[PDB]
Design a protein around this ligand. Structure first.
Ligand SMILES: Nc1ncnc2c1ncn2[C@@H]1O[C@H](COP(=O)(O)OP(=O)(O)OP(=O)(O)O)[C@@H](O)[C@H]1O
Ligand SMILES: Nc1ncnc2c1ncn2[C@@H]1O[C@H](COP(=O)(O)OP(=O)(O)OP(=O)(O)O)[C@@H](O)[C@H]1O
Lengths: 217, 81, 217, 81
């Protein structure tokens, strides 16, 4: 906790929100969030987790930047094509906020290693593209009991779900879903609002409609 | 009757958003095949493995019991991003 | 129209979307969109209109960048504080896509001038914060018959509406609404999907629920 | 009866999401004052000028005719961003 005079000015528009106040902004600073997948969604969500103020973020991805990715991953650029994504992203992110601590992790951890990593944070963001990983995550998160804000998108369709315990893709869709995630994360971290656990919010871009569907164990 | 709704890519392929159908499917899987047998386009749109069923605002197994009055929505699953 | 080999590679994930194809991507390139208000929303929406490929964009805002703005306006930075917003934004945007033509307009036009400007584009984006401006826009757009993708956000609440014819604010909310706008714009520009005209989609962040309400003349 | 729903900041201030009330308001504006007269918090939450009414999925003037069975939602207007 403990905001400086400068943080307190930059974070103002957040601090004055009824129910949030200085307290919320201190929670954010004290948080340690883990983002898995700095691609389409990982890029959208982190840009706002950073600007909002989550003090500590860990980027986890093994891939590198490429041309095609530049149709939607705003954090990356032509000058960074080839470079690994955790690094391209960290650089852009620390430009957005030089106040937070960013740690990049260029790799492909296995179950033993994810598990250790997860237990080290307060919340995880599923920003991946395959059920292999998504399953490890859901597994580790449940074992340590660490909240999971999971999301996905492809073509013109998105989904977002919370756990308290090729095909094309239109650029702005990753933004809708990505910013949804970053919102829910902040909600959990500061105990502000009511989380979207217990359901899946689906977004249909082709028609711009949102549906809510109840989940069952 | 049986308000069968369609969302996202599924509705895209089948060309309709909703369709009332005569009660006659024990399991959700029962309806899954009837509709899929309509054409190659329907076969693919409702292909097994690549579909998700939602019975009356709640997600359900491809077995949930279907009775008259039920509202079943068929949308695909999303991974990626 | 006419994509180069490089555009065709960068825009791929869009081109392969059924119904969009090369045709859509050529429409985008040929479009002339006008964004009014490069603040919280203007920043969110333009980042994806740029990466997606709208060939020509015109930034219209009279204000300058400031600290407080850096909690949510990702396009700006500490190094640009003080500089006008159209310029800070143009620079960041041309980094995202060196292929599009960006024109900044540091000013506060009146009705005569908005009207001339509007009639020069194919679509306008209402990204302002006051009914004075929003009204001029709605007025001019209706007169020339140019589509209006209007949006707004404050505290934890957003809205988006299409026309075919202080209080705090959580950072990620501007992202949800902003990316919604950029989506609908692309939809109109290429005739892809069905637009959200004839209603208001409201987003309640505190609970993560979306409502649709029918509009009347 | 009269399913009066509350959204966003409005629901925030009034502390409830929905409330059934006895039919007795000609205009939407009729209900607007009753509820606002409950307390200072209610007065502000439902203060005139800073409120928007939505009658049965459709937006309406602060005059639309209210009858029994109606669903009125009260949310604030948004400008900014
Ligand atoms: N096991 C994993 N650990 C870390 N990151 C992962 C893992 N599995 C997938 N990812 C990452 O998830 C990201 C998101 O991918 P997305 O589908 O968003 O873009 P891409 O995979 O980078 O795009 P493209 O469709 O151009 O191939 C990637 O950048 C990918 O590297
Ligand atoms: N007449 C107008 N012409 C051009 N831009 C306008 C006009 N009216 C308002 N704007 C711009 O709309 C933008 C969005 O403002 P937003 O409410 O998003 O941020 P701000 O006004 O910059 O933020 P803050 O709350 O820190 O004051 C501004 O950046 C403002 O300058």
């Amino acid at each position: 906790a403990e905001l400086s005079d400068q943080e307190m000015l930059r974070y103002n528009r957040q601090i004055i929100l009824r129910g949030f106040d200085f307290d919320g902004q201190e929670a954010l600073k004290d948080s340690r969030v883990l983002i898995v997948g700095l691609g389409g969604l990982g890029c959208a969500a982190s840009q706002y987790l950073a600007s909002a103020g989550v003090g500590n973020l860990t980027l986890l991805d093994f891939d590198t930047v490429s041309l095609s990715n530049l149709q939607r991953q705003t954090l990356h650029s032509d000058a960074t094509v080839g470079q690994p994504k955790v690094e391209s992203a960290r650089d852009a992110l620390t430009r957005i906020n030089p106040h937070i601590a960013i740690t990049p992790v260029n790799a492909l951890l296995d179950d033993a290693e994810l598990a250790a990593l997860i237990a080290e944070h307060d919340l995880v963001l599923d920003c991946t593209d395959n059920v292999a990983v998504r399953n490890q995550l859901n597994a580790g998160c449940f074992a340590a009991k660490v909240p999971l804000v999971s999301g996905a998108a492809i073509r013109m369709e998105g989904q977002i779900t919370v756990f308290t315990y090729e095909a094309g893709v239109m650029a702005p869709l990753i933004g809708v879903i990505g910013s949804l995630q970053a919102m829910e994360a902040i909600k959990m971290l500061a105990g502000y609002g009511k989380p979207a656990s217990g359901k899946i919010v689906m977004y249909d871009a082709m028609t711009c409609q949102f549906r809510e569907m109840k989940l069952m164990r | 009757m049986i308000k069968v709704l369609f969302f996202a890519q599924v509705r895209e392929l089948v060309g309709t958003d909703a369709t009332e159908v005569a009660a006659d499917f024990p399991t959700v899987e029962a309806l899954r095949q009837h509709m899929a047998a309509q054409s190659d386009r329907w076969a693919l749109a409702l292909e097994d493995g690549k579909l998700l069923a939602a019975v009356n605002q709640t997600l359900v197994s491809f077995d949930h019991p279907l009775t008259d009055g039920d509202e079943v929505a068929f949308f695909p699953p999303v991974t990626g991003g």
